[PDB]
Amino acid sequence: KIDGYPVDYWNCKRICWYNNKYCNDLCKGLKADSGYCWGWTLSCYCQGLPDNARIKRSGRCRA
Numbered sequence: 931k932i933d934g935y936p937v938d939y940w941n942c943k944r945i946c947w948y949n950n951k952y953c954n955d956l957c958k959g960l961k962a963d964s965g966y967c968w969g970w971t972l973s974c975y976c977q978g979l980p981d982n983a984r985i986k987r988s989g990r991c992r993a
Contacts, residue, residue, distance in 0.1 A: 935973040936960060937974065
């Protein structure tokens with residue numbers, strides 16, 4: 931059970947896709963039921979994912 935800012939795959943989306951629920955569906959895939967993106971500049975923010983969740987991976991748009 932971990933919480934933080936999960937990204938997509940190459941961090942090409944500033945660690946946050948775009949819409950609010952747009953990150954909840956992907957976060958839910960990582961078991962992060964409560965997953966919402968800050969529509970401002972705080973990247974995505976989901977809680978309830980595994981310790982191996984992919985968040986704060988750093989690295990510029992890898993794609």
